Amino acid sequence: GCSDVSTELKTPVYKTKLTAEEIRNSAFKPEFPKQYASYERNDETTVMT
Amino acid sequence: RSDDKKKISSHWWTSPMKDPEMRACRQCHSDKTPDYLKSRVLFTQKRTFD
Amino acid sequence: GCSDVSTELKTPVYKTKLTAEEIRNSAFKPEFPKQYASYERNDETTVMTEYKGSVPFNKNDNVNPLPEGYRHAQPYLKNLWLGYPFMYEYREARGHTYAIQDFLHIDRINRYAEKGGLPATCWNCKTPKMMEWVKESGDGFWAKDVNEFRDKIDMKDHTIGCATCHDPQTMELRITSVPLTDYLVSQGKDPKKLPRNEMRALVCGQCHVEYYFNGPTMGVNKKPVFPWAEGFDPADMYRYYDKHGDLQVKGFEGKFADWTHPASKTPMIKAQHPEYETWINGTHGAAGVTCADCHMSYTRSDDKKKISSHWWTSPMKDPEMRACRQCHSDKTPDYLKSRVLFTQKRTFDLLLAAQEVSVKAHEAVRLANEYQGAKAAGYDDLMIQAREMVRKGQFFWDYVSAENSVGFHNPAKALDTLAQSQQFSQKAIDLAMEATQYGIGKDLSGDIKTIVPPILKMNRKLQQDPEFMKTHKWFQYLPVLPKADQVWDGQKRLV
Amino acid sequence: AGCSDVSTELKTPVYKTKLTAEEIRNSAFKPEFPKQYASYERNDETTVMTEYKGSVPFNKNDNVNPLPEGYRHAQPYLKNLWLGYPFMYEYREARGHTYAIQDFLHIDRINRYAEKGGLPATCWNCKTPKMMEWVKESGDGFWAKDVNEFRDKIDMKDHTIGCATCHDPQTMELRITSVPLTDYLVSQGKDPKKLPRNEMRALVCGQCHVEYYFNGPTMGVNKKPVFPWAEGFDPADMYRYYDKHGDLQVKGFEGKFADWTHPASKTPMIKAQHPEYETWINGTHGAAGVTCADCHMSYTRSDDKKKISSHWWTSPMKDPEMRACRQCHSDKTPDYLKSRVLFTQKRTFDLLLAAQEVSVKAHEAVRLANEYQGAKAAGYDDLMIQAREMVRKGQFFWDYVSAENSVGFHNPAKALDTLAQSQQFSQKAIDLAMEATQYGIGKDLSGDIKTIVPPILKMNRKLQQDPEFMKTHKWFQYLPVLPKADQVWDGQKRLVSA
Amino acid sequence: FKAIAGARDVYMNTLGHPGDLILAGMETKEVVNANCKACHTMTNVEVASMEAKKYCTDCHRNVQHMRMKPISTREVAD
Numbered sequence A: 001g002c003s004d005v006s007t008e009l010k011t012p013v014y015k016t017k018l019t020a021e022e023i024r025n026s027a028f029k030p031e032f033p034k035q036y037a038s039y040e041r042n043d044e045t046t047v048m049t
Numbered sequence B: 001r002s003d004d005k006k007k008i009s010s011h012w013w014t015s016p017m018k019d020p021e022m023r024a025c026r027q028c029h030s031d032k033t034p035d036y037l038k039s040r041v042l043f044t045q046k047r048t049f050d
Numbered sequence C: 001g002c003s004d005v006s007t008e009l010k011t012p013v014y015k016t017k018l019t020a021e022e023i024r025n026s027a028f029k030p031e032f033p034k035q036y037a038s039y040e041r042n043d044e045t046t047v048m049t050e051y052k053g054s055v056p057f058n059k060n061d062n063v064n065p066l067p068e069g070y071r072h073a074q075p076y077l078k079n080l081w082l083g084y085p086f087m088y089e090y091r092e093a094r095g096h097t098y099a100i101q102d103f104l105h106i107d108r109i110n111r112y113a114e115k116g117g118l119p120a121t122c123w124n125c126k127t128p129k130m131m132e133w134v135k136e137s138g139d140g141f142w143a144k145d146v147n148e149f150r151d152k153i154d155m156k157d158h159t160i161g162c163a164t165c166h167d168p169q170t171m172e173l174r175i176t177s178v179p180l181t182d183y184l185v186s187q188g189k190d191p192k193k194l195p196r197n198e199m200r201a202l203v204c205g206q207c208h209v210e211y212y213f214n215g216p217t218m219g220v221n222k223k224p225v226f227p228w229a230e231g232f233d234p235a236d237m238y239r240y241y242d243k244h245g246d247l248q249v250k251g252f253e254g255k256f257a258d259w260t261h262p263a264s265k266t267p268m269i270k271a272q273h274p275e276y277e278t279w280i281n282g283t284h285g286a287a288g289v290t291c292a293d294c295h296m297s298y299t300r301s302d303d304k305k306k307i308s309s310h311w312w313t314s315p316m317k318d319p320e321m322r323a324c325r326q327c328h329s330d331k332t333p334d335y336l337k338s339r340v341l342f343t344q345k346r347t348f349d350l351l352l353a354a355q356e357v358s359v360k361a362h363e364a365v366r367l368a369n370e371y372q373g374a375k376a377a378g379y380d381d382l383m384i385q386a387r388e389m390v391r392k393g394q395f396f397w398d399y400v401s402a403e404n405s406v407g408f409h410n411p412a413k414a415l416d417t418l419a420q421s422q423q424f425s426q427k428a429i430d431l432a433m434e435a436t437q438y439g440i441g442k443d444l445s446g447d448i449k450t451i452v453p454p455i456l457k458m459n460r461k462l463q464q465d466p467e468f469m470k471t472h473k474w475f476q477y478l479p480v481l482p483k484a485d486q487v488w489d490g491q492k493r494l495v
Numbered sequence D: 001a002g003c004s005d006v007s008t009e010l011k012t013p014v015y016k017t018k019l020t021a022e023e024i025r026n027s028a029f030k031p032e033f034p035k036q037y038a039s040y041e042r043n044d045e046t047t048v049m050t051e052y053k054g055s056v057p058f059n060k061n062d063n064v065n066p067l068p069e070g071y072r073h074a075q076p077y078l079k080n081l082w083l084g085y086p087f088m089y090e091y092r093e094a095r096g097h098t099y100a101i102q103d104f105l106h107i108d109r110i111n112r113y114a115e116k117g118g119l120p121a122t123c124w125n126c127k128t129p130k131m132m133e134w135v136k137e138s139g140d141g142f143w144a145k146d147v148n149e150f151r152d153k154i155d156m157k158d159h160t161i162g163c164a165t166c167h168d169p170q171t172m173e174l175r176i177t178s179v180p181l182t183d184y185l186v187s188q189g190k191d192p193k194k195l196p197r198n199e200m201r202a203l204v205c206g207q208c209h210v211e212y213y214f215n216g217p218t219m220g221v222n223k224k225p226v227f228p229w230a231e232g233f234d235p236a237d238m239y240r241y242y243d244k245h246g247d248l249q250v251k252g253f254e255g256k257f258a259d260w261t262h263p264a265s266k267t268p269m270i271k272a273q274h275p276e277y278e279t280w281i282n283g284t285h286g287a288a289g290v291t292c293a294d295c296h297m298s299y300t301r302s303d304d305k306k307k308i309s310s311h312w313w314t315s316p317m318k319d320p321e322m323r324a325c326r327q328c329h330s331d332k333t334p335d336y337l338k339s340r341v342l343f344t345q346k347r348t349f350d351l352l353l354a355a356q357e358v359s360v361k362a363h364e365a366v367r368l369a370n371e372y373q374g375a376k377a378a379g380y381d382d383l384m385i386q387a388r389e390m391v392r393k394g395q396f397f398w399d400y401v402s403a404e405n406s407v408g409f410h411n412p413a414k415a416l417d418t419l420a421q422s423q424q425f426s427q428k429a430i431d432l433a434m435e436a437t438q439y440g441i442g443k444d445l446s447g448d449i450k451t452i453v454p455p456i457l458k459m460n461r462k463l464q465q466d467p468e469f470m471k472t473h474k475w476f477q478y479l480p481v482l483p484k485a486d487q488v489w490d491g492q493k494r495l496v497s498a
Numbered sequence E: 001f002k003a004i005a006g007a008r009d010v011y012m013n014t015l016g017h018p019g020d021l022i023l024a025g026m027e028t029k030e031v032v033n034a035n036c037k038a039c040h041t042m043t044n045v046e047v048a049s050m051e052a053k054k055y056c057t058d059c060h061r062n063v064q065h066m067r068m069k070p071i072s073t074r075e076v077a078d
């Protein structure tokens, strides 16, 4: 029969709305809210090992 | 695996020992407990600091 | 064709090499090294969360840094527990591996006499050694002095451990508690045939509960009882304590008291860690979500096979919140954290405000008790009523303050209980001013922190010093204690 | 039997109507959308009650009379706490959107015994899609006109809250027609025309179900509606906003906002209005992105086998089967879901009444301290300012919860926390007023507040004309006896000539 | 199973009147759950994960079609 692996693994490609010279962090937050929300964890400054 | 259960790359650049379950280490070292791995880290660091 | 599902899922069945009466933790380590390794994690005592954590700081101390005090502390605890053993020492709870170590360092128990002044019931939730001790002395165990068993126990091998919850031979879950078994029987429940989802909370409900000790005329002297007959809410327990007790004081006849506050002269109830009763009708409890679900979550640490976590600690210590994230797989860990704090931040602020009005209620009742001016015609009946409201006010904020989740187990019950606590305390103030025709008003004007300062330092040793006993106006309602050397230091007698 | 895979993009169905760009008549949508329309017509049901809410527009202060005049759960002190404010005349339980204009034109809050209603035309803002024509015609000068100017210039059924409020009449795409919400969105740097679908499924409601105020003459465009959202959505945030924005010249309150001065205590008050949106946004459902439409516009498969959004906007509790909820909570019985709603509601409503009681007592304490004839404390003037600040803060905090329509369910922890703080503020007002008078007012504050200051059950614009009725309660002494006057307006019908 | 399930699903889509809530029966709750165990035995072998909760999805709730997510992420008008 047919495979039900309908979703194939591909290396993500990205084309954003940002300019070649964009350097503001806040500008990236609309396009990548997951990685941005991850980046925000670096604000934690209370934990020692 | 924090977007449902899909992977993202962690952009939290910090000590790997902050995770009690050492998940960064436990794919390569799946045969070792978090506790074991942590003790091996400390085995080096404590002698290094002293 | 065939299945390659050659390994079939079966509920694990155990047959150990242990005797039916094994209680030493170390005896289980060879049989179960994975769960034992998990259990040893409770030795971590360095990590704080926002409101909780495993550093045993002093709960009234917001002045000193860790591990002495913390930024989130309740400054008025010694004031509010004046004349009770909790005015001596009261620390943040830490891991089960420390239960006996902490028991034996605590100043609540007298260490400046042979006798501790507390019953042997204090051991009830600290050691599986409770099974031998009760077998041996029966009903007579409870009213023994706590210090009689102080040197008859191994701090480490006999702390809360495997036999507390497990049959050593079969490893099936067990209720070993006397008072929890008493409660279950009273409900027509068989403690040996409890459904599994119920067991996964009841095992914790052996100890994480509100309790009291029988007085001499209440049943077996000093036997522990859970006051759960009227229901689980604060108003229910309050009502329970109206009906069961031994007080002879006018206006309070037959009610329960743990002590009477020496400033206000109010018959008080003490609340202790009511996690079970708080949890049971909160959003998770009522939905069948259990202590073990969050606090003993499955952890894939044996290669990739699940075991049950035996590290009983804050679920917030895992930055990835893995306990929560099967049920809440759609939410990020940090979202879940922000939602816990949404509750905790508000619960904690409200609590400090409830405790401040309670101190003022005690201070208003104190002033009205010692009033020399013209009193109302109904003064006596108004002072009874004011004391009833101090008592009820304190019990309500204490039911919340004592509970370890800072409102998360039951956000609505906690916030509502504190809102009510304020009402009762303020009404004590209103009745105390009416009783004195507003004559005490001048004495109640300031910030309460100025007219009754928080008591930061108080221990059994300092209560021996006659010049320290002059440093606060509430100290005059306490006796200066006889000069006495420390008798006990942990398990050693001192020479 | 079937071949291509599902698309994951969840493309919404697309429409092209025969309606013109500016069509606002509800009946014009009926021919093309009969299922949504018939569902909309279900808002006419005005008989069903729930435990705390429902559709009978009873008097919210009346716990004495039976339905439809009163109800077992009512707040007896509302007219006392809103003394000197239009809300003291009439304030009823909200009902279906289809009655919005009918109820607007019968309410005693708007003066019907003069030409002028005494309220700005801004009052039409969340009542009718006619707002678009009306603002286009007058612009900035629309807001400060008298409300009665438009009274005869509306169809009460064709121009109520309806399709054009939330939908582009040509494409039926969700739309924000609200001026003050657009002003807020633009202030946050958002494009109102390009918002995601999950945002819009709550924002269409946030056009109206919000706390608002009207500008004073020196605050910008006069009488223009503004959402006090710049400091955040919480009660403490809005209160802070109202400390920085406003126009009072009264000593101790310079530059703060006030809706009225309570004539008994002489406190400058803020009035709160139905903040569903601000309450929902950070509650357990809203924080999780569960929108107003998830529970209030649940998918229904009534006609054919085709599902549409329900457009019966009412209490979810009316449904014995709780279907809206079980689209998510499929593992819970309807019975369990209702008990968890009531877990919150009962506690919230009981604590509300207690907060209102201490609020009444704080007004009384400040009134007595104001009229006090004995020796006053040395810092009296400063203590009275503080006391009135606490009365004002305390009341805004309970009003924030009181006015919100889910009785704590949209945000349980915010509701109970806000009510707990309220009680603290009002009590501190009482404490400061006592101090100002060296406890000389103490004996006047001794009983149950219900016998000290009786609830005011009856009050309207007709009765305030009667000088014998105006001796019927102690607090009436602080109100004028209104001139004797015939009713000018009966609904839309004019009885006396201009 | 496929034939019986297909028959009643065809009937409900043609001559039946499905409600606003479509939910699984006891029959399908029990077959889905047995299939969780068929592919995930090894994760669960050393643990009593079948004993407390009746179904695997009582903990793995969103495996049941992401039911806790906002409606718009799942649903549109017909």
Ligand code: HEC
Residues within 6 Å of the ligand: A025, A028, A029, A032, A035, A036, A039, B007, B008, B009, B010, B011
């Ligand atoms: C700042 C806030 C950001 C944002 C929004 C993103 N990045 Fe990074 N990133 C870095 C590395 C080494 C990787 C893995 C690359 C690889 O192995 O191919 C990434 C990955 C990403 C992604 C891809 C998706 C994913 O989660 O894998 C995206 C969308 C992304 N990032 C966005 C390295 C860095 C940095 C080095 C110090 C810094 C700074 C950032 N990234 C910052 C950001």
Ligand code: HEC
Residues within 6 Å of the ligand: B016, B024, B025, B028, B029, B037, B038, B040, B041, B044
């Ligand atoms: C996460 C922070 C960790 C920790 C704590 C450790 N590892 Fe690794 N590891 C990897 C490889 C290739 C080696 C060399 C052995 C080999 O060739 O197979 C190691 C070695 C170690 C050790 C032993 C040396 C020591 O310092 O004691 C220890 C204690 C150790 N590791 C701990 C491979 C990987 C990974 C794959 C890409 C990753 C990820 C890690 N290791 C991460 C960690």
Ligand code: HEC
Residues within 6 Å of the ligand: C049, C050, C051, C052, C053, C054, C093, C201, C204, C205, C208, C275, C276, C277, C279, C280, C284, C285, C289, C290, C291, C292, C293, C294, C295, C313, C314, C315, C316, C317, C340, C404, C405, C406, C408, C409
């Ligand atoms: C069943 C009746 C129980 C018992 C006996 C306990 N819990 Fe919980 N718990 C949960 C969360 C998110 C917290 C806050 C953690 C933090 O603030 O860092 C707690 C807290 C506790 C404590 C205090 C822990 C500490 O750090 O000292 C204790 C002693 C405790 N709980 C016992 C989460 C949950 C649940 C998830 C929904 C459930 C169910 C329970 N807890 C139930 C119980």
Ligand code: HEC
Residues within 6 Å of the ligand: D054, D055, D093, D094, D095, D096, D097, D098, D099, D100, D101, D103, D104, D125, D126, D127, D128, D161, D165, D166, D204, D205, D206, D207, D208, D209, D292, D293, D296, D297, D313, D314, D315
């Ligand atoms: C977004 C889709 C919504 C939702 C979910 C609700 N509304 Fe409104 N509403 C408005 C007015 C003026 C009233 C009172 C009308 C009257 O009393 O005559 C209401 C009433 C309600 C209710 C109560 C219904 C009941 O049966 O009790 C409910 C549940 C409700 N609303 C929810 C005003 C507006 C608008 C102004 C133009 C807009 C837009 C909305 N509401 C949108 C929504």
Ligand code: HEC
Residues within 6 Å of the ligand: D050, D051, D052, D053, D054, D055, D094, D095, D202, D205, D206, D209, D276, D277, D280, D281, D285, D286, D290, D291, D292, D293, D294, D295, D296, D314, D315, D316, D317, D318, D341, D405, D406, D407, D409, D410
């Ligand atoms: C988005 C911000 C909104 C808006 C504008 C409203 N809701 Fe809800 N709502 C829900 C429940 C269980 C109740 C209680 C009903 C009852 O007790 O009978 C309510 C109540 C309301 C009202 C009052 C209804 C009335 O009878 O007048 C209004 C006007 C209202 N809501 C509007 C359920 C939910 C949700 C489910 C989780 C969500 C999300 C919302 N509501 C969000 C909103």
Ligand code: HEC
Residues within 6 Å of the ligand: D012, D029, D030, D033, D036, D037, D040, D161, D162, D163, D164, D165, D166, D167, D172, D174, D197, D200, D201, D204, D205, D293, D297, D307, D308, D309, D310, D311, E072, E076, E077
């Ligand atoms: C007047 C009675 C109408 C008519 C004829 C329609 N609407 Fe509405 N609608 C609103 C919301 C939030 C949605 C969901 C949008 C989404 O999920 O993306 C809808 C949906 C519709 C549709 C689309 C088909 C469907 O049934 O889902 C159609 C054709 C439709 N409606 C027609 C919000 C509102 C309102 C805000 C308060 C008001 C008013 C109306 N709708 C009124 C009407």
Ligand code: HEC
Residues within 6 Å of the ligand: B030, C304, E039, E040, E041, E042, E043, E044
């Ligand atoms: C190629 C060699 C790989 C790799 C690198 C991984 N897989 Fe699989 N896998 C499958 C199933 C059903 C499970 C769950 C079993 C259970 O729940 O008991 C897994 C498990 C994993 C894991 C986690 C466990 C571990 O051993 O570390 C990992 C890291 C993993 N896989 C990666 C299903 C399949 C396949 C379908 C027939 C195939 C092919 C693979 N897996 C192959 C691989």
Ligand code: HEC
Residues within 6 Å of the ligand: B005, C293, C297, C298, C299, C300, C301, C322, C323, C326, E036, E037, E040, E041, E043, E044, E049, E050, E052, E053, E055, E056, E057, E058, E059, E060
């Ligand atoms: C019924 C027998 C099942 C089946 C078939 C599975 N589970 Fe669970 N599970 C629970 C928790 C807290 C975790 C996380 C542990 C960790 O992160 O280390 C898991 C994990 C899984 C997986 C791995 C999935 C993944 O995200 O990688 C799988 C395949 C799995 N389980 C299957 C919690 C629970 C329960 C709560 C008490 C119950 C019941 C189950 N699991 C039961 C089952």
Ligand code: HEC
Residues within 6 Å of the ligand: B001, B002, B023, B024, B027
């Ligand atoms: C390191 C650079 C990795 C490579 C290359 C691949 N994976 Fe991975 N994987 C990695 C980590 C650090 C984790 C842990 C994620 C977490 O949140 O814990 C994973 C996880 C998985 C899983 C889930 C396994 C489990 O713990 O249950 C699977 C099924 C998985 N990875 C598969 C997988 C495949 C098929 C890969 C090739 C394309 C692959 N991984 C690459 C690290 C790394």
Ligand code: HEC
Residues within 6 Å of the ligand: C053, C054, C092, C093, C094, C095, C096, C097, C098, C099, C100, C102, C124, C125, C126, C127, C160, C164, C203, C204, C205, C206, C207, C208, C291, C292, C295, C296, C312, C313, C314
């Ligand atoms: C009596 C025998 C107990 C049983 C059964 C359970 N708990 Fe307990 N717990 C008990 C004590 C006496 C203490 C404090 C001991 C100390 O040395 O301070 C605790 C502590 C906890 C904590 C705090 C851990 C920390 O902060 O690191 C937690 C989170 C906790 N207990 C949870 C818990 C759960 C979930 C239980 C059921 C399985 C449970 N405990 C059982 C006493 C007893």
Ligand code: HEC
Residues within 6 Å of the ligand: D330, E022, E023, E024, E028, E029, E032, E055, E057, E063, E064, E065
């Ligand atoms: C296993 C991982 C699943 C796959 C693959 C699919 N579904 Fe599912 N489905 C699953 C569960 C755990 C449940 C809930 C069962 C219970 O105990 O209640 C369901 C339920 C349904 C339903 C209706 C009920 C509902 O909750 O929505 C339908 C109509 C359904 N399932 C159909 C369906 C289809 C068409 C799938 C392929 C695209 C499919 N399911 C995949 C688990 C799993």
Ligand code: HEC
Residues within 6 Å of the ligand: C283, C284, C287, C289, C290, C293, C294, C315, C323, C324, C327, C328, C336, C337, C339, C340, C411, D284, D329, D332, E058, E059
């Ligand atoms: C399944 C067994 C669960 C686990 C483990 C956790 N939660 Fe949970 N959660 C669960 C249910 C059944 C509910 C009620 C809603 C429902 O679907 O019936 C919830 C609710 C919450 C909420 C919202 C309520 C609130 O008080 O804020 C939050 C914030 C929440 N849950 C968080 C949370 C955390 C932090 C957990 C681990 C420590 C956790 N949940 C575990 C089911 C389950």
Ligand code: HEC
Residues within 6 Å of the ligand: D090, D091, D092, D093, D094, D103, D104, D107, D109, D110, D119, D122, D123, D124, D125, D126, D207, D208, D209, D210, D211, D212, D225, D274, D403, D405
């Ligand atoms: C949007 C920002 C509004 C403005 C501006 C005004 N009203 Fe309103 N109204 C609005 C909502 C969301 C509701 C239902 C919620 C509720 O709690 O009532 C209402 C309700 C009414 C009613 C009927 C209920 C009642 O109070 O008796 C009337 C008569 C009414 N509104 C009139 C009115 C007046 C006089 C206004 C100016 C002072 C006014 N509204 C402004 C939304 C909004």
Ligand code: HEC
Residues within 6 Å of the ligand: C025, C028, C029, C032, C035, C036, C039, C160, C161, C162, C163, C164, C165, C166, C171, C173, C196, C199, C200, C203, C204, C292, C296, C306, C307, C308, C309, C310, E046, E047, E048, E049, E051, E052
């Ligand atoms: C406070 C109660 C408690 C204590 C103390 C305790 N356990 Fe457990 N234990 C549980 C619960 C609850 C479970 C899961 C029960 C279930 O689902 O049947 C469990 C599970 C287990 C299991 C089954 C395998 C697994 O990981 O789920 C073993 C084996 C076990 N415990 C051994 C131990 C050992 C060894 C110790 C001492 C170091 C110990 N227990 C202490 C409550 C406890």
Ligand SMILES: CCCCCCCCCCCCO[C@@H]1O[C@H](CO)[C@@H](O[C@H]2O[C@H](CO)[C@@H](O)[C@H](O)[C@H]2O)[C@H](O)[C@H]1O
Residues within 6 Å of the ligand: A001, A002, A003, A004, A005
């Ligand atoms: C008419 C002559 C008949 C003789 C047979 C020759 C024609 C039929 C063969 C067509 C070739 C495709 O063959 C087909 O490959 C896919 C893989 O992509 C397999 O698919 C298999 O693996 C995938 C995962 O990789 C699973 O999703 C699937 O459940 C499983 O069945 C099919 O089970 C197999 O049948």
Ligand SMILES: [Ca+2]
Residues within 6 Å of the ligand: C052, C053, C054, C055, C092, C093, C094
């Ligand atoms: Ca702790």
